[PDB]
């Protein structure tokens, strides 16, 4: 059950579920496993907010264990393409594609709360075909892995060699260690 | 009146006001007819303004995709296509079939023209799609792709047998989109 | 199913996309035919006739066919109501779906270029859908003949031609369907 | 279910005094039909009501609830068969107001009552043999009364699980007119 | 699908609730009983003087749920008329017979069975076992209620409730289970 | 908002009249909804009585205790009315209405007995241990003794038996004040 | 479940009972803690802060606990927002539920007389909820110590006392929870 609120607008009073009410504040929630359904809803929200004001910052709250790589890339490309800066805030956790999106927020505007944790490692499951008739072949997996490593090296400032070595490890960084690595700019 | 993110009500319906359609997930008759309905609605509301279809789809049923294809070509407005995430099979065919000059891909999206057997089989219990009809449809799909990409029929027929994804830049070079939005 | 919001005297209102097009006298006949969807189409035809008995109605058809008596409920309602019912095949029309396509108002039956049409009627459409109903062999043969007569009447083909061709479970292209008399025009 | 503006399509047609009896007959759909009939009577006890019937039949006492309500309310209840009417569906069709029972040209009508409609639908209810024979006779009497056939004829013919065409249903007295 | 009417929008049952009509339909259990109790209390508060009608088409069901309806019918100020359409069995039959004196009705092809099967008495919850002596107490209580409202003697009810046979509308009227067959 | 019996429902309309329905098994979900209605009613008017209609087989002890503590804490008097039955936690809450304002209808039944099932962990990772069960059983007995006027030894003996009391016997025992 | 409808000059507006209480700045933390309910609680906190950053917020807590990182999302949001967040235990609070109860604004943490509090954290709360995530032994130990430090800070107990007492999977009464520093007052 998602609670509702009633807010005054220029057009009169209107009812909102809590997430649509926070969308009016240019806040978007990326929560749970990443897949096409939820990634396309986030793409839709980013496009809508850009249409509403292309200059004002947008915030994505991230609490996600990661998930499907191409779904996460659709969010990534949309974040980069729209005119507004997209600020990222990790609460709870960001892993795999969740961590990649966190680290890809606008420079200076990536944040983690004190007890959140960040894991860059990309499990095989995120790369496999999600539809019954799609088999994702080894070379394409290797291309995607290098692509993700290059994106991380670029946004963190780490070298490519460093990202590719560290992404093999299946462990979490604390918010402070994630800030030190360049995955976020500030622990709030 | 009331607004939600997930079902000027839900986010998708608000963007439909902006002449934007989302083609997402597997293509089957249910979602293809919703897209046909959105296309016919937008043409009736304004037969002059462009329409955009965002495509993130692993493909699916061939006749359902052909329903979308025929509607796109038939209505008066130019239909622009944008690949986000991926486009495979019928999804790649539809991406390639947007209005000339108005087909786009985002930099990390991927495109695969290959059409698996599963798209051609009968979806209803009492329908059996026979081998000659499969070959006829595969050829028609190849000719549609040859026409919109500028590749020869022979090149399409050879390359569609491989089930590999192209990058967005490679898909532009192949003629499946006109521009990578970067 | 997306929504379309319009403002009015007393606030604003919301239609789903299908309801919005029903305002424009378009009906969607999509998916397998059964009693549930057939009665909804009958309800829409009756509503549009009562709203304006003079203006045409369009049914878009994308269907593999299905239950014969449910399709017959739609057929009789199309014939009975006052407005001309135009039909447009998008995707495919098989079995009862093809019969209803062919039964649109004369001159107003259409197919899109990549549409396909199959008149063949599989056994499954004729069998009992209810637990306590067993549809017997002679009734199947009788209904198969009634369907062939409807097709002969609307296509202009001989009953002998329809009976021969309906035994083959093969599709016609839009162009071949138009030449056969199943539609009047490829759009 | 499409909408018209704000009614769903069936509610919009209920405003025009049309009720849809569709699908298998059971207590749930019967009681919705009874409610609609009572509502329409209260709204206007003079104007005719129409019931569109497309149904394979079903539970006998649920059908009898509809039958008794059609007979009891003041408005004439016209019936129209679209698609098919079997078992209690056929009984209800034949029980519309005299002169106002219709069938469309390709509809079909079967008066036969399978054993399934008489059995207990609740777990703790067993419908016994003599009650079945009483109900079968009551249904036959209702059909003889509304069709004009003799009781003997109905009792013989109802044993066959065959459909009548719309024309043969009119000839038998199950409807007054085939509509074209 | 439950149709709607516009007058605001009402589903068909809420529209008829405005006309002080309640539908008791299907098997009786706590869920549906408490909804009927709420409708009775709502109608009493809206107008404690005007009659209420309950239409009953029910195979019966859980005894204590039915007793919740019975007690509420007796307690509220309005007369509660009952009308049997289709059938009334077990607790449904009891509730039909318990409408206000002179205002209990059956339609001509309605049927009524007072018999109470064992299933209505057993515990519906996981941790409740309804014991034999409590079943016997409740069976006697139901028989006393029927005797009071029908005018039959207690042992006449006890004899006839043992048989799981239906009464026609005419025979239910003759027995005192309703006052009138509406023709 | 549209109106139904089952948008604006019948229970919501009655909440406007300060009536709350406690119906069915007691668990966290329904108990938290009752706490919410109690807090809402107290904020709307802290002086007017509230009524809880109780028809319940009982259920989870800590869920019932959430309702109990909220009834005692809020300012309004909470009247309780048993319809159908009240067992276990349902009987405890009935017995805990405002003094003088606890009621039973003539055919309702009340069983104070607390089955083991109400005390066990409801979450997968919670094991409720034996000494905590004994502590809770004693607390519930103390609550019943206080509200009924019976001795603790009387409650402790009687709660062992999984038998129902009639409305008249519940009133005589002090579980309600009046049979209506 | 239930609705509250309020009349206005432009007709009627409707809430469910929880949304109506949200209007009074009360949030309900009920049932097992997981990402779904935790993100709903985070959103409610951020909304109430944006609506009025000065006024207190109350969380009613009736929970057997649950997923540790979901509860940590709520914890961090409670500490970050400007308003004081009061906590009230009704029923019970265990594991993450007990931690969040203890984490309300100093002096504004309450328990009702028959509620019970269990700080113990079962293994199940630390394990991966996602199919592709295995939460490893060293991360579990790190999270366990962090929870003990959070509890020590808010209760006033030493780290050693928390670490010893959290191993036992027993409940504290409301009065014992108050004496331990887990709430400030039994209401
Ligand atoms: Cl306003
Ligand atoms: Cl093939
Ligand atoms: Cl046969
Ligand atoms: Cl028989
Ligand atoms: Cl028998
Ligand atoms: Cl007979
Ligand atoms: Cl017994
Ligand atoms: Cl490990």
Coordinates of N, CA and C in Angstrom, one line a residue, chain F residues 3-174:
Chain F
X3 N -19.5 5.2 -4.6 CA -20.0 4.5 -3.4 C -20.1 3.0 -3.7
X4 N -19.6 2.2 -2.8 CA -19.8 0.8 -2.9 C -20.2 0.2 -1.5
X5 N -20.8 -1.0 -1.6 CA -21.0 -1.7 -0.3 C -19.7 -2.4 0.1
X6 N -19.0 -3.0 -0.8 CA -17.7 -3.7 -0.5 C -16.6 -3.1 -1.2
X7 N -14.9 2.3 -3.7 CA -14.4 3.6 -3.2 C -14.8 3.9 -1.8
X8 N -15.9 4.5 -1.6 CA -16.4 4.8 -0.3 C -17.2 3.6 0.1
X9 N -16.7 2.8 1.0 CA -17.4 1.7 1.4 C -18.2 1.8 2.7
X10 N -18.9 0.8 3.0 CA -19.8 0.9 4.1 C -19.1 1.0 5.4
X11 N -17.9 0.4 5.6 CA -17.2 0.5 6.8 C -16.6 1.9 7.0
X12 N -16.2 2.6 5.9 CA -15.8 4.0 6.0 C -16.9 4.9 6.4
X13 N -18.1 4.7 5.8 CA -19.2 5.5 6.2 C -19.5 5.4 7.7
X14 N -19.4 4.2 8.2 CA -19.7 4.0 9.7 C -18.6 4.5 10.5
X15 N -17.3 4.5 10.1 CA -16.2 5.2 10.8 C -16.5 6.6 11.0
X16 N -17.2 7.3 10.1 CA -17.6 8.6 10.2 C -18.6 8.8 11.4
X17 N -19.3 7.7 11.8 CA -20.1 7.7 13.0 C -19.4 7.1 14.2
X18 N -18.1 7.0 14.2 CA -17.2 6.5 15.3 C -17.5 5.0 15.6
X19 N -17.8 4.2 14.6 CA -17.9 2.8 14.8 C -16.8 2.1 14.0
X20 N -16.1 1.2 14.7 CA -15.0 0.4 14.1 C -15.3 -1.0 14.2
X21 N -15.1 -1.8 13.1 CA -15.3 -3.2 13.0 C -14.1 -4.0 13.2
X22 N -14.0 -4.8 14.2 CA -12.9 -5.8 14.4 C -13.5 -7.2 14.1
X23 N -13.1 -7.7 12.9 CA -13.8 -8.9 12.3 C -12.8 -9.8 11.8
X24 N -12.9 -11.1 12.1 CA -12.0 -12.1 11.5 C -10.8 -12.3 12.4
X25 N -9.9 -13.2 12.0 CA -8.7 -13.4 12.8 C -7.9 -12.2 13.0
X26 N -7.3 -12.1 14.2 CA -6.5 -11.0 14.6 C -5.1 -11.3 14.2
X27 N -4.5 -10.4 13.5 CA -3.1 -10.4 13.1 C -2.6 -9.0 12.9
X28 N -1.3 -8.8 12.6 CA -0.7 -7.5 12.6 C -1.5 -6.6 11.6
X29 N -1.8 -7.1 10.4 CA -2.4 -6.2 9.4 C -3.7 -5.6 9.9
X30 N -4.6 -6.4 10.4 CA -5.9 -5.9 10.8 C -5.8 -5.1 12.1
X31 N -4.8 -5.5 13.0 CA -4.7 -4.8 14.2 C -4.1 -3.4 14.0
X32 N -3.2 -3.2 13.1 CA -2.6 -1.9 12.8 C -3.7 -1.0 12.2
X33 N -4.6 -1.5 11.4 CA -5.6 -0.8 10.8 C -6.6 -0.3 11.9
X34 N -6.8 -1.1 12.9 CA -7.7 -0.7 14.0 C -7.0 0.4 14.9
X35 N -5.7 0.2 15.1 CA -5.0 1.3 15.9 C -5.1 2.6 15.1
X36 N -5.0 2.5 13.8 CA -5.1 3.7 13.0 C -6.4 4.4 13.1
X37 N -7.5 3.6 13.1 CA -8.8 4.1 13.2 C -9.1 4.8 14.6
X38 N -8.5 4.1 15.6 CA -8.6 4.7 17.0 C -7.9 6.0 17.1
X39 N -6.7 6.1 16.6 CA -5.9 7.4 16.6 C -6.6 8.4 15.8
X40 N -7.1 8.1 14.6 CA -7.9 9.0 13.8 C -9.1 9.5 14.5
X41 N -9.9 8.7 15.2 CA -11.1 9.1 15.8 C -10.7 10.0 17.0
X42 N -9.7 9.7 17.8 CA -9.3 10.5 18.9 C -8.9 11.9 18.5
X43 N -8.1 12.0 17.4 CA -7.7 13.3 16.9 C -8.9 14.1 16.4
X44 N -9.9 13.4 15.8 CA -11.0 14.1 15.2 C -11.9 14.7 16.4
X45 N -12.0 13.9 17.5 CA -12.8 14.4 18.6 C -12.3 13.6 19.8
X46 N -11.5 14.2 20.7 CA -11.0 13.4 21.9 C -12.0 13.2 23.0
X47 N -13.3 13.7 22.9 CA -14.2 13.5 23.9 C -15.3 12.6 23.7
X48 N -15.7 12.3 22.4 CA -16.8 11.4 22.1 C -16.4 9.9 22.2
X49 N -17.3 9.1 22.7 CA -17.1 7.7 22.8 C -16.8 7.1 21.4
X50 N -16.1 6.0 21.4 CA -15.9 5.1 20.2 C -16.5 3.8 20.5
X51 N -17.1 3.1 19.5 CA -17.6 1.7 19.6 C -16.8 0.8 18.7
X52 N -16.4 -0.3 19.2 CA -15.8 -1.4 18.4 C -16.7 -2.6 18.4
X53 N -17.2 -3.0 17.2 CA -18.0 -4.2 17.1 C -17.0 -5.3 16.9
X54 N -17.1 -6.4 17.6 CA -16.2 -7.5 17.7 C -16.9 -8.8 17.2
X55 N -16.4 -9.4 16.2 CA -16.8 -10.7 15.8 C -15.5 -11.4 15.3
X56 N -14.9 -12.2 16.2 CA -13.5 -12.6 15.9 C -13.2 -13.9 16.6
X57 N -12.6 -14.9 15.9 CA -12.0 -16.1 16.6 C -10.7 -15.8 17.4
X58 N -10.3 -14.5 17.4 CA -9.0 -14.3 18.1 C -7.8 -14.3 17.2
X59 N -6.7 -14.6 17.7 CA -5.5 -14.6 16.9 C -4.2 -14.2 17.6
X60 N -3.4 -13.4 17.0 CA -2.0 -13.2 17.4 C -2.0 -12.3 18.6
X61 N -1.3 -12.7 19.7 CA -1.4 -12.0 21.0 C -0.8 -10.6 20.9
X62 N 0.4 -10.5 20.3 CA 1.0 -9.1 20.3 C 0.2 -8.1 19.4
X63 N -0.4 -8.6 18.4 CA -1.3 -7.8 17.6 C -2.5 -7.4 18.4
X64 N -3.1 -8.3 19.2 CA -4.2 -7.9 20.0 C -3.8 -6.9 21.1
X65 N -2.6 -7.1 21.6 CA -2.1 -6.2 22.7 C -1.8 -4.8 22.1
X66 N -1.5 -4.6 20.9 CA -1.4 -3.3 20.3 C -2.7 -2.6 20.3
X67 N -3.8 -3.4 20.0 CA -5.2 -2.8 20.1 C -5.5 -2.4 21.5
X68 N -5.2 -3.4 22.4 CA -5.5 -3.1 23.9 C -4.8 -1.9 24.4
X69 N -3.5 -1.7 24.1 CA -2.8 -0.6 24.7 C -3.3 0.7 24.1
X70 N -3.8 0.7 22.8 CA -4.2 1.9 22.1 C -5.6 2.3 22.7
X71 N -6.5 1.3 22.9 CA -7.8 1.6 23.6 C -7.6 2.2 24.9
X72 N -6.7 1.7 25.7 CA -6.5 2.3 27.1 C -5.8 3.7 27.0
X73 N -5.0 3.9 26.0 CA -4.2 5.1 25.9 C -5.0 6.3 25.5
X74 N -5.8 6.2 24.4 CA -6.5 7.3 23.8 C -7.5 7.8 24.8
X75 N -7.9 9.1 24.7 CA -8.7 9.8 25.6 C -10.2 9.3 25.6
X76 N -10.8 9.1 24.4 CA -12.2 8.6 24.4 C -12.5 7.3 25.1
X77 N -13.6 7.2 25.7 CA -14.1 5.9 26.1 C -14.3 5.0 24.9
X78 N -13.9 3.7 24.9 CA -14.1 2.8 23.9 C -15.1 1.7 24.3
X79 N -16.3 1.8 23.8 CA -17.4 0.8 24.0 C -17.1 -0.4 23.2
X80 N -17.4 -1.6 23.7 CA -17.2 -2.8 22.9 C -18.5 -3.6 22.8
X81 N -18.8 -4.2 21.7 CA -20.1 -4.9 21.4 C -19.7 -6.2 20.7
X82 N -20.1 -7.3 21.3 CA -19.8 -8.6 20.7 C -21.0 -9.1 19.9
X83 N -20.8 -9.4 18.6 CA -21.8 -9.9 17.7 C -21.1 -11.2 17.1
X84 N -21.9 -12.3 17.0 CA -21.3 -13.5 16.6 C -20.5 -14.2 17.7
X85 N -19.2 -13.8 17.8 CA -18.3 -14.5 18.8 C -17.1 -13.6 19.1
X86 N -16.5 -13.9 20.2 CA -15.3 -13.3 20.6 C -14.5 -14.4 21.3
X87 N -13.4 -14.8 20.8 CA -12.5 -15.7 21.4 C -11.1 -15.2 21.5
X88 N -10.4 -15.7 22.5 CA -9.0 -15.4 22.8 C -8.8 -13.9 22.9
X89 N -7.9 -13.4 22.0 CA -7.7 -12.0 22.1 C -9.0 -11.2 21.8
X90 N -9.9 -11.7 20.9 CA -11.1 -11.0 20.7 C -11.9 -10.9 22.0
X91 N -11.9 -12.0 22.8 CA -12.6 -11.9 24.1 C -11.9 -11.0 25.1
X92 N -10.6 -11.0 25.1 CA -9.9 -10.1 25.9 C -10.2 -8.6 25.6
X93 N -10.2 -8.3 24.3 CA -10.5 -6.9 24.0 C -12.0 -6.5 24.3
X94 N -12.9 -7.4 24.1 CA -14.3 -7.2 24.5 C -14.3 -6.9 26.0
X95 N -13.7 -7.7 26.8 CA -13.7 -7.5 28.2 C -13.0 -6.2 28.6
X96 N -12.3 -5.5 27.7 CA -11.5 -4.3 28.0 C -12.1 -3.0 27.5
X97 N -13.3 -3.1 27.1 CA -14.0 -1.8 26.8 C -14.2 -1.0 28.0
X98 N -14.5 0.3 27.8 CA -14.8 1.1 29.0 C -15.8 0.5 29.9
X99 N -15.5 0.6 31.2 CA -16.4 0.0 32.2 C -17.8 0.5 32.1
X100 N -18.8 -0.4 32.2 CA -20.2 -0.1 31.9 C -20.6 0.0 30.5
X101 N -19.7 -0.1 29.5 CA -20.0 0.1 28.1 C -19.5 -1.1 27.3
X102 N -19.5 -2.3 27.9 CA -19.2 -3.6 27.2 C -20.5 -4.4 27.0
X103 N -20.8 -4.8 25.8 CA -22.1 -5.4 25.5 C -22.0 -6.7 24.7
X104 N -23.0 -7.5 24.8 CA -23.1 -8.7 24.0 C -24.5 -8.8 23.5
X105 N -24.7 -9.3 22.3 CA -26.0 -9.6 21.7 C -26.5 -10.9 22.2
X106 N -27.8 -11.2 22.2 CA -28.3 -12.4 22.9 C -27.7 -13.7 22.5
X107 N -27.3 -13.9 21.2 CA -26.8 -15.2 20.7 C -25.3 -15.2 20.5
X108 N -24.6 -14.2 21.0 CA -23.1 -14.2 20.9 C -22.5 -15.1 21.9
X109 N -21.3 -15.5 21.6 CA -20.6 -16.4 22.5 C -19.1 -15.9 22.7
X110 N -18.6 -16.2 23.9 CA -17.3 -15.6 24.3 C -16.5 -16.7 24.9
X111 N -15.2 -16.8 24.4 CA -14.3 -17.8 24.9 C -12.9 -17.2 25.3
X112 N -12.6 -17.1 26.6 CA -11.3 -16.5 26.9 C -10.1 -17.3 26.6
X113 N -10.2 -18.6 26.4 CA -9.1 -19.5 26.2 C -8.1 -19.0 25.2
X114 N -6.8 -19.1 25.4 CA -5.8 -18.6 24.5 C -5.0 -19.8 24.0
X115 N -5.2 -20.2 22.7 CA -4.5 -21.3 22.1 C -3.0 -20.9 22.0
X116 N -2.2 -22.0 22.0 CA -0.7 -21.8 21.8 C -0.4 -21.0 20.5
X117 N -1.2 -21.2 19.5 CA -0.9 -20.6 18.2 C -0.8 -19.1 18.2
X118 N -1.6 -18.5 19.1 CA -1.5 -17.0 19.2 C -0.2 -16.5 19.8
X119 N 0.6 -17.3 20.4 CA 1.8 -16.9 21.1 C 3.1 -17.1 20.2
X120 N 3.0 -18.0 19.2 CA 4.2 -18.4 18.5 C 4.6 -17.2 17.6
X121 N 5.9 -17.3 17.2 CA 6.4 -16.3 16.3 C 5.6 -16.4 15.0
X122 N 5.3 -15.2 14.4 CA 4.7 -15.1 13.1 C 5.7 -14.7 12.0
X123 N 6.8 -14.1 12.3 CA 7.9 -13.9 11.4 C 8.8 -15.2 11.3
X124 N 9.3 -15.4 10.1 CA 10.1 -16.6 9.9 C 11.3 -16.7 10.9
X125 N 11.9 -15.6 11.2 CA 13.1 -15.6 12.0 C 12.9 -15.3 13.5
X126 N 11.6 -15.4 14.0 CA 11.3 -15.2 15.4 C 10.8 -16.5 16.0
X127 N 11.5 -16.9 17.0 CA 11.1 -18.1 17.9 C 10.7 -17.5 19.2
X128 N 9.4 -17.7 19.6 CA 9.0 -17.2 20.9 C 9.2 -18.3 21.9
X129 N 10.0 -18.0 23.0 CA 10.4 -19.1 23.8 C 9.4 -19.3 25.0
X130 N 9.6 -20.5 25.6 CA 8.6 -20.9 26.6 C 8.4 -19.9 27.8
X131 N 9.5 -19.3 28.3 CA 9.3 -18.5 29.4 C 8.6 -17.2 29.0
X132 N 8.8 -16.7 27.8 CA 8.0 -15.5 27.3 C 6.5 -15.9 27.1
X133 N 6.2 -17.1 26.7 CA 4.8 -17.6 26.6 C 4.2 -17.5 28.0
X134 N 4.9 -18.1 29.0 CA 4.3 -18.1 30.4 C 4.1 -16.7 30.9
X135 N 5.0 -15.8 30.6 CA 4.9 -14.4 31.0 C 3.7 -13.7 30.4
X136 N 3.5 -13.9 29.1 CA 2.4 -13.4 28.4 C 1.0 -13.9 28.9
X137 N 1.0 -15.3 29.1 CA -0.2 -15.9 29.6 C -0.6 -15.3 30.9
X138 N 0.3 -15.0 31.8 CA 0.0 -14.5 33.1 C -0.4 -13.0 33.0
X139 N 0.2 -12.2 32.1 CA -0.2 -10.9 31.9 C -1.7 -10.8 31.4
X140 N -2.0 -11.6 30.4 CA -3.4 -11.7 29.9 C -4.4 -12.1 31.0
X141 N -4.0 -13.0 31.8 CA -4.8 -13.4 33.0 C -5.0 -12.3 33.9
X142 N -4.0 -11.5 34.2 CA -4.1 -10.3 35.1 C -5.0 -9.3 34.5
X143 N -4.9 -9.1 33.2 CA -5.8 -8.1 32.5 C -7.3 -8.6 32.6
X144 N -7.5 -9.8 32.4 CA -8.9 -10.3 32.5 C -9.4 -10.2 34.0
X145 N -8.6 -10.6 34.9 CA -9.0 -10.5 36.3 C -9.4 -9.0 36.7
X146 N -8.6 -8.1 36.2 CA -8.8 -6.7 36.5 C -10.2 -6.2 35.9
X147 N -10.4 -6.5 34.7 CA -11.6 -6.0 34.0 C -12.9 -6.8 34.3
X148 N -12.8 -8.0 34.7 CA -14.0 -8.8 35.0 C -14.4 -8.8 36.5
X149 N -13.4 -8.5 37.4 CA -13.6 -8.6 38.8 C -13.4 -10.0 39.4
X150 N -13.0 -11.0 38.5 CA -12.7 -12.3 39.0 C -11.3 -12.4 39.6
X151 N -11.1 -13.4 40.5 CA -9.7 -13.6 41.0 C -8.8 -14.1 39.9
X152 N -7.5 -13.9 40.1 CA -6.5 -14.4 39.2 C -6.6 -15.9 39.1
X153 N -6.8 -16.6 40.3 CA -6.9 -18.0 40.3 C -8.1 -18.5 39.5
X154 N -9.2 -17.8 39.6 CA -10.4 -18.2 38.8 C -10.1 -18.1 37.3
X155 N -9.5 -16.9 36.9 CA -9.2 -16.7 35.5 C -8.2 -17.8 35.0
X156 N -7.2 -18.1 35.8 CA -6.2 -19.0 35.4 C -6.7 -20.4 35.2
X157 N -7.7 -20.8 36.1 CA -8.3 -22.1 36.0 C -9.2 -22.1 34.8
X158 N -10.1 -21.1 34.6 CA -11.1 -21.1 33.6 C -10.5 -21.0 32.2
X159 N -9.4 -20.3 32.1 CA -8.8 -20.0 30.7 C -8.3 -21.3 30.1
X160 N -8.0 -22.3 30.9 CA -7.5 -23.6 30.4 C -8.5 -24.3 29.5
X161 N -9.8 -24.1 29.8 CA -10.9 -24.8 29.1 C -11.3 -24.1 27.8
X162 N -11.2 -24.8 26.7 CA -11.6 -24.2 25.4 C -13.1 -24.4 25.1
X163 N -13.9 -23.8 26.0 CA -15.3 -23.8 25.9 C -15.8 -22.3 25.8
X164 N -17.0 -22.2 25.1 CA -17.7 -20.9 25.0 C -18.6 -20.6 26.2
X165 N -18.7 -19.4 26.5 CA -19.8 -18.9 27.4 C -20.9 -18.2 26.6
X166 N -22.1 -18.5 26.9 CA -23.2 -17.7 26.3 C -23.1 -16.3 26.7
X167 N -23.9 -15.4 26.1 CA -24.0 -14.0 26.4 C -24.4 -13.8 27.9
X168 N -25.4 -14.5 28.3 CA -25.8 -14.4 29.7 C -24.7 -14.8 30.7
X169 N -24.0 -15.9 30.4 CA -22.9 -16.4 31.2 C -21.7 -15.4 31.2
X170 N -21.5 -14.8 30.0 CA -20.4 -13.9 29.9 C -20.7 -12.6 30.8
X171 N -21.9 -12.2 30.8 CA -22.3 -11.0 31.6 C -22.1 -11.4 33.1
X172 N -22.6 -12.5 33.5 CA -22.5 -12.9 34.9 C -21.0 -13.0 35.3
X173 N -20.1 -13.4 34.4 CA -18.7 -13.6 34.7 C -18.0 -12.2 34.7
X174 N -18.6 -11.2 34.2 CA -18.0 -9.9 34.2 C -17.3 -9.5 32.9

